[PDB]
Amino acid sequence: KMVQSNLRLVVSIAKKYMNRGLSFQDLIQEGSLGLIRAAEKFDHEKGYKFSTYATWWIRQAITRAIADQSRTIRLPVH
DNA sequence: ATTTTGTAGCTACTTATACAAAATTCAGGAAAATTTTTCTGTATAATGGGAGCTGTCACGGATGCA
């Protein structure tokens, strides 16, 4: 009831990579993945909203997808 | 009348054997060394996209119908 509760914003992020590559939907997922992870690695004790932390993990997730594939010959993401 | 042919012959004399360890190298292993690939985090806040295309057909359907 939180990961989904967010939903939007992650699409505002993923959509930035919908044109970068992969696929709007493809992205969305990826984020989602992240979303999760964040969604729980996350600590309301530091107060400031997940908007300044959830979006972190997202981004991460994503990048690791158009770089992890979307190329049909995987190269050292590094 | 020597010479070539001999015969009755060996001895020297040299392959032949086979082994043989000694080389002598090679391969594989093993690391170990290290280089390259992976993995993970990131704290103000951030909360719906892109596009357009716009000139046959057919048919069977067309359910849908009024």
From Swiss-Prot:
The keyword Cell cycle does not apply. A motif (Interaction with polymerase core subunit RpoC) lies at residues 26-29. The keyword Transcription regulation applies. It is found in: Cytoplasm. Its main location: cytoplasm. Belongs to the sigma-70 factor family. RpoD/SigA subfamily. This is RNA polymerase sigma factor SigA. The chain holds residues 157 to 234 of 390 of the full protein.
